[PDB]
Design a protein around this ligand. Sequence first.
Ligand code: MG
Ligand code: MG
Ligand code: MG
Ligand code: MG
Ligand code: MG
Ligand code: MG
Ligand code: MG
Ligand code: MG
Ligand code: MG
Ligand code: MG
Ligand code: MG
Ligand code: MG
Ligand code: MG
Ligand code: MG
Ligand code: MG
Ligand code: ZN
Lengths: 69, 55
Amino acid sequence: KKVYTTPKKIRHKHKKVKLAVLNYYKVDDEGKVAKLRKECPNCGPGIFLANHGDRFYCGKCHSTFATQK
Amino acid sequence: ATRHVLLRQGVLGIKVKIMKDPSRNTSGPKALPDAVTIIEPKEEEPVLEPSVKDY
RNA sequence: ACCCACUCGGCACCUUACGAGAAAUCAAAGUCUUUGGGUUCUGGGGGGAGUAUGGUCGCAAGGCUGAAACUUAAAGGAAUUGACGGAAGGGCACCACCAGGAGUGGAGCCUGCGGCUUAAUUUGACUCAACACGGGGAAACUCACCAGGUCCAGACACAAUAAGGAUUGACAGAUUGAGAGCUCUUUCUUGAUUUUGUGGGUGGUGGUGCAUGGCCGUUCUUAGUUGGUGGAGUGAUUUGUCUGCUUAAUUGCGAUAACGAACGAGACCUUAACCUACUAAAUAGGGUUGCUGGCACUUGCCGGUUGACUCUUCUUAGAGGGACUAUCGGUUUCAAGCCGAUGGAAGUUUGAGGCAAUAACAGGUCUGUGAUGCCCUUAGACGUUCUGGGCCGCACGCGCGCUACACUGACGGAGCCAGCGAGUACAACCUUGGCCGAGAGGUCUGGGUAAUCUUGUGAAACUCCGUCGUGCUGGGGAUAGAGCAUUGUAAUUAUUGCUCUUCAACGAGGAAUUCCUAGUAAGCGCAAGUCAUCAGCUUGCGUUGAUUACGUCCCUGCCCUUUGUACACACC
Ligand SMILES: [Mg+2]
Ligand SMILES: [Mg+2]
Ligand SMILES: [Mg+2]
Ligand SMILES: [Mg+2]
Ligand SMILES: [Mg+2]
Ligand SMILES: [Mg+2]
Ligand SMILES: [Mg+2]
Ligand SMILES: [Mg+2]
Ligand SMILES: [Mg+2]
Ligand SMILES: [Mg+2]
Ligand SMILES: [Mg+2]
Ligand SMILES: [Mg+2]
Ligand SMILES: [Mg+2]
Ligand SMILES: [Mg+2]
Ligand SMILES: [Mg+2]
Ligand SMILES: [Zn+2]
């Protein structure tokens, strides 16, 4: 065979930067709950939005929002 | 019937040929087509008078 | 001077050897392990070496005489089978040659392979038996090559995080060839699938066909191959398997230490040839007749209709037969057979293939292969996958091919007859008929999963009447420009078609050498194969259809046979 090329730069799959208890939602009293951000309009509650500078997208429906909140 | 087979050292080239007997072949001819087998003849008695035999 | 018989002396042959001998052979090389007639001489693996030395002899050359050290596993002899031989006879074959044909090589163009070039122009194959081959006509794919990126397709085993996440995803623009989350900008998803290591694998058009299998090719479709007894030899072996004549053939006659056998050849098989003799048909074709179109106009001629009735010549295609060199003539030991007439569809093994032995070859294939050994590799993968290229580049070498160098023509019309084929329902196949378009090609509609429709595939070359007449001319179409089509996601490095224009080389090709003996060669086209699209390619098919042998060993090759052979990895 002929020799291989070798530019240099290699790109690996990102490790993701995992995190737990992360870090939305709150409770002031104890019993009741006080949701932060919002839940999904399309799917049922339990799934939450993603808050950026006037841009949102969900996870269960890959990336399907548009309107602000 | 050919069949490739291992072993560990390399692949072995088995072939097998079995010339089946014509008599027990059934399908096709019951004989190899060059094989001509002539039957035995049968004897008779010449003359013994012209003779007859009525009913 | 013979003949004939026998004899002392000389020089040599034949057969059996029962005697010798390793055998070749030998009536001596016999009378030798059943060892002794007499005598002289020489040799003790090969070399070193007939050398060194010393004599001794010679004019000298040289002779006679004659070492070891060292070296080495064989050196020989004879024969056996091979292989080989610029040895000799005897065969065979248009992959040999004649007698001819068609050519190719020249011309242009395709298309192989060199060579050069390139980032890559991927490689295999190099006398027949590499070179229009890899079913290899590559636009990407294919793809192995190169420039770039992506992906894990990292089986399982054991451990480190084990939810205070193991890790999966990810629009927006910069990023990036790029609505590749390829990522760095991000801060939302995902729930133990995995990811980090170490064993271990998996894949790899990586490597080695000189590690192999299968298949193929090639010796060779040549006529060769083998054994069982029996003989000859100690034996390897051999004879059988051969002086001749035949055959396409080790095919047979025949002669014969061989007899009868098998393999291969043949037989066989498939196909192509013949059937007014069967069995059969509105998916094959005809006859009468109905309706119905036209004619001449008498009754007659052509039709068109799946209206009826019936038939099987053609057609298919079953089942049979048929050819056996048959009959006659010569000709040949009046054998095997060959040669000529007659008839007969068939008288070339009737034509063609299909299979095709022994033994092999370091032929070719690791790029058909989850056929594969072992070296490679195994996440920056030589894996995979996308994206663009590249195999097609050109001073130039050869190799199949095509088109022509015209008047046996070219161009117009007109006439107008084939066969093999092949073809879609989960796709997009063959695609008539009707309209549009100079074309190509669109479109509606069908028929067809096919002796039914495409399709009589009314294919071409041909045949007729005209235009030009032997001028690089209307021959010849290459190179070019522009457009109009079609395939596909994508056509520039024209995919192909069509349009008009360009009109180059080339007035039958040197040395060479290919193919060929009958429905063949040569011409012509069709056809499937590959194919979305491309035919100069190819395996089939049918059309037109000669010339010239119907022999020979002159060349080439091969084969035996005898001979030789310091060869046996076998003339590299
Ligand atoms: Mg590379
Ligand atoms: Mg010695
Ligand atoms: Mg082709
Ligand atoms: Mg192409
Ligand atoms: Mg593969
Ligand atoms: Mg014997
Ligand atoms: Mg022999
Ligand atoms: Mg034949
Ligand atoms: Mg080999
Ligand atoms: Mg491999
Ligand atoms: Mg090529
Ligand atoms: Mg060829
Ligand atoms: Mg048809
Ligand atoms: Mg001109
Ligand atoms: Mg040959
Ligand atoms: Zn959503």
